[PDB]
Amino acid sequence: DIAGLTPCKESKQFAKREKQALKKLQASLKLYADDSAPALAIKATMEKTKKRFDNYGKYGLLCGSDGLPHLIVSGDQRHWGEFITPGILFLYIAGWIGWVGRSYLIAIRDEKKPTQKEIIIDVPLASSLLFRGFSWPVAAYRELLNGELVDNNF
Amino acid sequence: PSLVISLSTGLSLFLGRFVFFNFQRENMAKQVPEQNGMSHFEAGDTRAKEYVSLLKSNDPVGFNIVDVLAWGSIGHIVAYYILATASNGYDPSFF
Amino acid sequence: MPGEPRPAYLDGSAPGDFGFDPLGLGEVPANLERYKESELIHCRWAMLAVPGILVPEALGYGNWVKAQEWAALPGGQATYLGNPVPWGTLPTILAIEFLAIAFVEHQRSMEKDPEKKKYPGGALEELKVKEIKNGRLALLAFVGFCVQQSAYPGTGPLENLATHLADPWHNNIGD
Amino acid sequence: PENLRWFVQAELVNGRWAMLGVAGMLLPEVFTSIGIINVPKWYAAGKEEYFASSSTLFVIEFILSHYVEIRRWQDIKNPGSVNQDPIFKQYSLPAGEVGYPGGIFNPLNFAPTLEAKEKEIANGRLAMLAFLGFIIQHNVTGKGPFDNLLQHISDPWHNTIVQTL
Numbered sequence: 254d255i256a257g258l259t260p261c262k263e264s265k266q267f268a269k270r271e272k273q274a275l276k277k278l279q280a281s282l283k284l285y286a287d288d289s290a291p292a293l294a295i296k297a298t299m300e301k302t303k304k305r306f307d308n309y310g311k312y313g314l315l316c317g318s319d320g321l322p323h324l325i326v327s328g329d330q331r332h333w334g335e336f337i338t339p340g341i342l343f344l345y346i347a348g349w350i351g352w353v354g355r356s357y358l359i360a361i362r363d364e365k366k367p368t369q370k371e372i373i374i375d376v377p378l379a380s381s382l383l384f385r386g387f388s389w390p391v392a393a394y395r396e397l398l399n400g401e402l403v404d405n406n407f
Numbered sequence: 408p409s410l411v412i413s414l415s416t417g418l419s420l421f422l423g424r425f426v427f428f429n430f431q432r433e434n435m436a437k438q439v440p441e442q443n444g445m446s447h448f449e450a451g452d453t454r455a456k457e458y459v460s461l462l463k464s465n466d467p468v469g470f471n472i473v474d475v476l477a478w479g480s481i482g483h484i485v486a487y488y489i490l491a492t493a494s495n496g497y498d499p500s501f502f
Numbered sequence: 503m504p505g506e507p508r509p510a511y512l513d514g515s516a517p518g519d520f521g522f523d524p525l526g527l528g529e530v531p532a533n534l535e536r537y538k539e540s541e542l543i544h545c546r547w548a549m550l551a552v553p554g555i556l557v558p559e560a561l562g563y564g565n566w567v568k569a570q571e572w573a574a575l576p577g578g579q580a581t582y583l584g585n586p587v588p589w590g591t592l593p594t595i596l597a598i599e600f601l602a603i604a605f606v607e608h609q610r611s612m613e614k615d616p617e618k619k620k621y622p623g624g625a626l627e628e629l630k631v632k633e634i635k636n637g638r639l640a641l642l643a644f645v646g647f648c649v650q651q652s653a654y655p656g657t658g659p660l661e662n663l664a665t666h667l668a669d670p671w672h673n674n675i676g677d
Numbered sequence: 678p679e680n681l682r683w684f685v686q687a688e689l690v691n692g693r694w695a696m697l698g699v700a701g702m703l704l705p706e707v708f709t710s711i712g713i714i715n716v717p718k719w720y721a722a723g724k725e726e727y728f729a730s731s732s733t734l735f736v737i738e739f740i741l742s743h744y745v746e747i748r749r750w751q752d753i754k755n756p757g758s759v760n761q762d763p764i765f766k767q768y769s770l771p772a773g774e775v776g777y778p779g780g781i782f783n784p785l786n787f788a789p790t791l792e793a794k795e796k797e798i799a800n801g802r803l804a805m806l807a808f809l810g811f812i813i814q815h816n817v818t819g820k821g822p823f824d825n826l827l828q829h830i831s832d833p834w835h836n837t838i839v840q841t842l
């Protein structure tokens with residue numbers, strides 16, 4: 254409800270330009286609609302869509318003039334998450350690749366002699382080398398801030 | 408609805424600070440000099456300053472700023488002009 | 503340093519040179535390492551603005567306030583004239599009291615020895631913890647509530663009939 | 678294995694706050710009966726009181742909390758700690774943190790500390806499996822039943838995600 258941008262439910266545009274945009278693919282009477290492939294340009298799909306119409310709805314995004322999702326989190330109201338509730342994971346999903354990324358490498362001086370010892374990967378991964386990826390920060394993310402860094406290692 | 412002060416007090420406040428200083432003690436610091444010809448910075452030298460050049464004239468300095476502004480400035484424009492004519496044309500305290 | 507490592511309020515035990523073997527603050531650094539204008543001033547201040555404040559009575563009898571007591575100051579003076587001065591109000595009265603004050607602790611300027619601290623050795627109530635050591639709790643005692651005195655200045659520091667305000671705000675405003 | 682006697686207490690602390698944590702909503706736990714997602718508070722109460730919201734039960738009872746917890750922290754740090762249950766040892770006889778302050782930089786070892794029975798420890802973690810049952814339902818299926826000879830292992834119904842909420 255903030256800055257504009259209305260929650261979709263007053264429908265004005267979006268919902269209609271929608272029930273327009275998608276719905277002249279629908280005028281695909283211009284073929285023969287029964288069973289097809291070769292055609293189904295009409296009947297289905299709209300299932301994902303129109304039979305997801307008033308569905309999408311539904312949490313607002315306060316989709317806005319034009320009548321489309323102006324997608325915003327910034328840390329106000331329910332939204333504090335339309336990208337943050339799915340905004341952290343990414344952080345999470347990446348830099349523990351860094352762990353594998355690190356400990357894969359930080360092995361590539363152990364057992365001794367290295368590099369292409371980088372090309373032949375010694376199938377490097379599946380558990381703790383990754384499956385620590387699971388559990389890094391605020392329990393041990395300060396794998397950073399002691400003996401591994403510094404750095405302090407040799 | 409504004410007293411034009413604070414500022415216009417401080418536009419004078421340190422004006423009055425370098426009419427200031429230094430009648431007698433030869434010719435008003437040092438010495439004099441520096442002028443043209445150039446004696447100072449990156450001809451060579453270029454160093455190395457203190458600052459206790461304050462402390463002298465301060466106790467003095469306060470008086471003159473923060474009342475003549477009420478005898479000069481916001482102190483009439485004064486009689487006097489006399490002399491006389493009278494007087495400059497003699498003036499309304501303008502107003 | 504930062505934490506979770508630190509920092510020896512956990513006794514010593516304790517003090518403590520000897521003892522039992524300790525440190526603890528790190529044997530006497532200085533966030534100025536030399537040192538003042540702003541330091542120990544954080545102290546004798548608010549001891550003695552805050553006594554000046556006891557003065558607003560709780561009143562259950564009536565008070566207020568004197569004979570001349572300035573009429574919120576704006577125009578009960580002087581009535582002059584002589585003449586005639588300011589209005590009064592504005593910069594002029596607000597000019598006298600100033601540089602009058604402005605000279606009193608600035609002749610103090612000249613200071614170096616007699617006596618600069620302990621400094622190397624000795625070989626204001628003299629040695630005084632108490633009378634001075636309050637210096638702290640007499641500052642923030644004050645802000646402590648002038649925070650609300652710039653928060654919700656409702657009407658009269660009746661303070662608690664309700665709770666401990668504690669409102670709570672939340673740390674945000676929100677969360 | 679994994680690592681060194683780093684946190685014990687941290688997670689111990691956790692397991693301490695744990696059982697009586699899962700004792701908390703363990704009132705909704707229903708002696709026999711009285712549950713749901715909660716609002717109230719032990720029994721009674723009726724002073725003046727413990728209140729809302731220009732008050733909150735929060736900041737009052739949980740500012741002062743801070744010095745009650747920092748004492749431990751700095752207590753850990755500079756040991757510091759009883760004589761000695763929690764950091765660490767006197768009686769009798771838990772799972773040993775075992776080590777002393779340093780390694781070869783770190784490893785002159787690191788973990789020969791297993792051995793025994795069922796024992797003391799356990800229940801500390803029990804309540805976090807409790808939790809990962811007990812949290813998951815309560816907004817997914819917000820009541821807790823157990824029901825034999827009736828229709829356990831039969832069911833009855835269905836209930837998924839998108840309904841709505």
Ligand SMILES: CC1=C(/C=C/C(C)=C/C=C\C(C)=C/C=C/C=C(C)/C=C/C=C(C)/C=C/C2=C(C)CCCC2(C)C)C(C)(C)CCC1
Pocket residue numbers: 348349351394397
């Ligand atoms: C508090 C505050 C804030 C902040 C701000 C800022 C911006 C500041 C600055 C600050 C600082 C002082 C900073 C620094 C930082 C640092 C860093 C450093 C970052 C990061 C990082 C990285 C780079 C990482 C890496 C890694 C890790 C660590 C983990 C994962 C993996 C890897 C290894 C990759 C806010 C916003 C809230 C506002 C108010 C106040």
